[PDB]
């Protein structure tokens, strides 16, 4: 979280938290209810978000869903949307934690090696995530949509 990150840096330098570290915990916790609302809205529309990302993806890359494509077929496509459902879930976790610790251990560290084995094209997974940003972001107020957007762009960043 913001808490975990602050503390780990504190303990590693053998010290109490800084004024800065204390301030960010305070600003973070003040945004608690708002962050929880952002996760709720997105949890509430998860099935819709996954499908609209999936349409946006297959237009932009009809090949992935083509003879020599990693997601070619009905059940190679079913698993692909399931992976898109996984990442949206992790994005809701990140938003309520206020950093990526959880998102990272669960779904980016090791992701290159996993997908290389499965021979999944990584950069088109990054596209599927942009597609989810676009849908999710259209169900949130301007301010909340930006706050959510940072976590989408992080995942897009880590698959790189």
């Amino acid at each position: 979280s913001v808490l975990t990150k602050a503390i780990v840096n504190a303990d590693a330098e053998a010290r109490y938290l800084s004024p800065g570290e204390l301030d960010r915990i305070k600003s973070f916790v003040a945004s608690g209810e708002r962050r929880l609302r952002i996760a709720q809205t997105l949890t509430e529309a998860r099935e819709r978000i996954v499908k609209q990302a999936g349409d946006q993806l297959f237009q932009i890359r009809p090949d992935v869903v083509s003879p020599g494509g990693n997601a070619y077929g009905e059940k190679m496509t079913a698993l692909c949307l399931r992976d898109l459902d996984y990442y949206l879930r992790l994005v809701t976790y990140g938003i309520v934690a206020g950093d990526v610790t959880p998102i990272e251990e669960i779904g980016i560290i090791g992701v290159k090696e996993m997908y290389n084995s499965l021979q999944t094209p990584i950069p088109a997974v990054a596209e599927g995530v942009r597609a989810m940003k676009n849908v999710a972001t259209s169900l949130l107020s301007g301010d909340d949509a930006a706050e959510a957007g940072f976590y989408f762009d992080y995942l897009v960043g880590a698959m790189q």
């Binding site: 979280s1 808490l3 975990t4 503390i7 780990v8 504190a10 303990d11 109490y16 938290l17 204390l22 915990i25 305070k26 916790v29 608690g32 209810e33 929880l36 996760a39 709720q40 949890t43 998860r46 996984y86 879930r89 809701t92 976790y93 309520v96 934690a97 610790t101 959880p102 669960i106």
Partner: protein, 161 residues
């Protein structure tokens, strides 16, 4: 380590569940006490040295412990003991901020009972040193924070006994 919030995230992650109403209620129960945790940490940190001195004075020194044959005899060992005390105070302050005792297990209790048995360090006397610092802390931090600080000192002390 984990805090209140990551405790919940990891409990749901292993089930692959999006956060539901029960989860969201737990996290609220943490956020709603958060500002008070911060204020309490600033009191403890800034009174650190005085808490150790008053805790040692009530529970350790003026005794056989500090006399020849005692484990906190010699400036070396007296220094090691109040060094330890500072660890406890400091980590309990971390646990209370995090709202989770997991750090007290990972970085303080693991192997410590046997380490103390191996050096001869008196366990019961160390617990009193912990419960005296709690007593002082609970005065300094006030109604708002007293119960919440207290529990992680109690976590520490039943971890040794």
């Amino acid at each position: 380590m984990q805090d209140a919030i990551t405790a919940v995230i990891n409990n749901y992650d292993v089930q692959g569940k999006y956060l539901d109403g029960a989860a969201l209620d737990k996290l609220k129960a943490y956020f709603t006490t958060g500002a008070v945790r911060v204020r309490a940490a600033a009191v403890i940190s800034s009174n650190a040295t005085t808490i150790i001195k008053e805790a040692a004075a009530k529970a350790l020194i003026y005794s056989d412990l500090t006399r020849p044959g005692g484990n906190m005899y010699t400036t070396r060992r007296y220094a090691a003991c109040i060094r330890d005390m500072d660890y406890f105070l400091r980590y309990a302050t971390y646990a209370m901020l995090a709202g989770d005792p997991s750090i007290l297990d990972e970085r303080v209790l693991n192997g410590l009972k046997e380490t103390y048995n191996s050096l001869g360090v008196p366990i019961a006397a160390t617990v009193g040193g912990i419960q005296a610092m709690k007593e002082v802390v609970g005065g300094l931090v006030g109604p708002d924070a007293a119960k919440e600080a207290s529990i992680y000192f109690d976590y520490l002390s039943s971890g040794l006994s």
